[PDB]
């Protein structure tokens, strides 16, 4: 889906396989978090289904030793003085020592400030011990989380369930046409993007010689050259787009290890999985009811949440026992208008628009002239532009499989805008489908006339114990607006421990709040209380993080101030265009004459046993009878019903279904004498 999904897929540990656990038989005690997982397996990121607790992700600092046991670094302390000498310990080795936390106060050297220190002990036990009894020390307060979980700002303010959901859902975001990095991050994004490998990095220092959308040429110091080719509009395993864009000029000088081009979800070498949107946290007319979302129409006009998806279609020409089925434009009994887009060979032309039912590759097979039409079509609900064709011909000594002459492949791409039914999500486990998309003219707007891009309901935040989204909203407004702490007479007491270079910022400043060592509540209040004015010279959000909005439909100001700010929204790969399906008649299974199952097979919706229980409880006998007989496997009833409907007649009576006959035949095959008495 994106670089993060693959990176986390490679760093995955699974307990089930040829010689492991069973996804069903596994009990509740093998799926639990163990004290020995601290620093070796992340406790947050796991699936939600039957694989809950059986598949995990390796921690950031962990490594495996030769025997196959996961290790983790610890910082040695001598006589209560923390030294800088990292040692890697296995769980059994670690159980013989006591290790302190990274958040242990220090006094500019190793010496511990406090006389007693809270330490970890053998079996998940913590005790206060004098500072002279401490053996080791963590290297950071993020030693236990994994890569995906380390990209959630204000993680410690979120409950475990929502953090798990957010970590899982960051791996489902789709690349967008244009990317932008978050206003408020955590810092585990530059390295995540670089290590994933979807960006292009300069191997050696030099000066960019020629830069184009297709390549970059670097003139190394020693006189050598190296050209990098960018993969443009490629297709991923999941149908997304993998396009790389250079981010260097024609005279710039690069350094070894510097990012030289971007990737799918990268912005200047940093992960950028979503967009920054101006949000309101009020309930609005019931359109954002029960996890639904309301969007502005600007996000559609300006292609903020637009994506490119690529399909792959292929057909082959076999020898066949009949003989030599061929690809050509001469298809019998087809209007010359229907063959307008096909070229001389018999394939569509690049740059042609294709719709459902359109011809992609004309082919005829000699069923016996008797040559029928077996051409390649565009499936239901699929369209776009033909962007490429690849044809392999045996006549050109191509390594084709046995018995095939041509293997033409066709790629069609389409840009998808955001629409009702698509799934959005933030980084804190907040998700929902788009209930409505409103005109810009009837969105709540600020005193200066700025509409809000998205509206989230108030009733979902406090119940789910994910209050990190509100903190992210506050800090995002602070970063977007800019600030300046008025330290005219000493810094305010709430900014005493605030790092220098953080007492002032310009509009649209990018900041980071690491996972367990970041911004505090007092600092957030202080920053909210001192922000720069807007263009006119007015402060729109007060010290509480709440603004006074207008009603776009009636024009009256809302009675009470609302909470506004900026948060990071991602577009999940759960689009409604891939989920709508309908059927009236189509293929049927051969053993039992019932409709096939599957959207790709043009199948029918299963009416299982519990729906039958519900229908029997209603007392609806005729509905159930028709569902079971004339809609599923009554071979003559189906055709009679279709004839009756296409005429003005009324539906006939049903008959014996075919599955009962199949059951009787199987029972007889078991050597049982089954008979129907009358």
């Amino acid at each position: 889906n994106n670089p993060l999904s693959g990176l986390t897929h490679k760093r995955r540990l699974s307990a089930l396989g040829p010689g492991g656990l069973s996804r069903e038989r596994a009990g509740l005690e093998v799926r639990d978090v163990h004290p020995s997982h601290y620093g070796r397996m992340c406790p947050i990121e796991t699936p939600e289904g039957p694989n809950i607790g059986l598949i995990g992700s390796l921690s950031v600092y962990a490594r495996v030793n030769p025997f196959g046991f996961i290790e983790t670094p610890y910082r040695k302390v001598v006589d209560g003085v923390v030294s800088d000498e990292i040692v890697y310990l296995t769980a059994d080795e670690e159980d013989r020592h006591v290790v302190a936390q990274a958040n242990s106060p220090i006094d500019a050297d190793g010496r511990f400030v406090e006389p007693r220190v809270l330490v970890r002990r053998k079996a998940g036990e913590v005790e206060y011990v004098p500072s002279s009894e401490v053996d080791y020390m963590d290297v950071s307060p993020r030693q236990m989380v994994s890569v995906a979980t380390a990209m959630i700002p204000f993680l410690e303010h979120d409950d475990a369930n929502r953090a798990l959901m957010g970590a899982n859902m960051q791996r489902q975001a789709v690349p967008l046409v244009r990317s932008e990095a978050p206003l408020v991050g955590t810092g585990m994004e530059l390295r995540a993007a670089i290590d994933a490998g979807d960006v292009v990095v300069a191997e050696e220092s030099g000066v960019i010689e020629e830069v184009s959308a297709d390549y970059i040429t670097v003139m190394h110091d020693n006189g050598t050259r190296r050209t990098y080719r960018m993969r443009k509009f490629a297709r991923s395993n999941h149908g997304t787009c993998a396009n790389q864009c250079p981010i260097v000029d024609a005279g710039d000088r690069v350094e070894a290890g510097q990012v030289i081009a971007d990737g799918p979800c990268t912005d200047d070498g940093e992960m950028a999985l979503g967009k920054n949107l101006l949000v309101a946290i009020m309930p609005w007319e019931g359109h954002n009811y029960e996890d639904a979302i309301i969007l502005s129409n600007r996000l559609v006009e300006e292609d903020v949440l637009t994506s490119i998806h690529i399909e792959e279609h292929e057909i082959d020409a076999r020898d066949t026992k009949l003989g030599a089925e061929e690809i050509t434009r001469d298809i019998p009994n087809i209007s010359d208008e229907v063959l307008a887009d096909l070229d001389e060979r018999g394939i569509v032309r690049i740059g042609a628009e294709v719709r459902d039912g359109d011809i992609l590759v004309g082919k005829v097979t000699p069923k016996g002239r008797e040559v029928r039409d077996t051409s390649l079509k565009v499936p239901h609900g699929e369209s776009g532009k033909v962007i490429g064709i690849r044809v392999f011909s045996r006549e050109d000594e191509d390594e084709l499989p046995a018995g095939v002459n041509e293997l033409v492949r066709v790629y069609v791409a389409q840009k998808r805008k955001i629409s009702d039914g698509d799934k959005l999500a933030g980084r804190h486990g907040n998700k929902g489908v788009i209930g409505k998309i409103l005109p810009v003219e009837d969105m709540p707007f600020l005193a200066d006339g700025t509409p809000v891009d998205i509206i989230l309901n108030t009733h979902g935040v406090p119940r789910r114990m994910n209050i990190g989204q509100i903190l992210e909203t506050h800090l995002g407004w602070c970063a977007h607006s800019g600030w300046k702490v008025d330290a005219a007479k000493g810094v305010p007491d709430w900014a005493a421990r605030l790092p220098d270079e953080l007492l002032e910022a310009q509009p649209n400043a990018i900041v980071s709040t690491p996972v367990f060592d970041g911004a505090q509540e007092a600092e957030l209040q202080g920053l909210l209380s001192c922000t720069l004015p807007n263009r006119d010279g007015d402060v729109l959000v007060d010290a509480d993080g709440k603004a006074m909005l207008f009603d776009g439909r009636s024009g009256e100001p809302f009675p009470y101030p609302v909470t506004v700010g900026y948060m990071y929204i991602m577009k999940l790969h759960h689009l409604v265009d891939d989920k709508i399906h309908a059927r009236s008649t189509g293929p049927y299974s051969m053993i039992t004459q019932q409709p096939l199952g599957g959207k790709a097979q043009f199948g029918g919706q299963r009416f299982g046993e519990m729906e039958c229980w519900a229908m029997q409880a209603y007392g609806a006998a005729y509905t159930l009878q028709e569902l079971l007989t004339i809609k599923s496997d009554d071979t003559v009833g189906r055709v009679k019903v279709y004839e009756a409907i296409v005429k003005g007649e009324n539906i006939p009576e049903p008959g014996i279904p075919e599955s009962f006959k199949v059951l009787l035949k199987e029972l007889q095959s078991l050597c049982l004498n089954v008979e129907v008495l009358s």
Binding site: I194, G257, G269, L498
Partner: peptide
């Protein structure tokens, strides 16, 4: 105050962290 100084062409992202990292990822 910034986040990263090892990667050459990295964006200047300022951090609220108060702790020093002895070891690099």
């Amino acid at each position: 105050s910034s986040s990263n100084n090892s990667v050459p062409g990295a964006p200047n992202r300022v951090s609220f962290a108060k702790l020093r990292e002895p070891l690099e990822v």
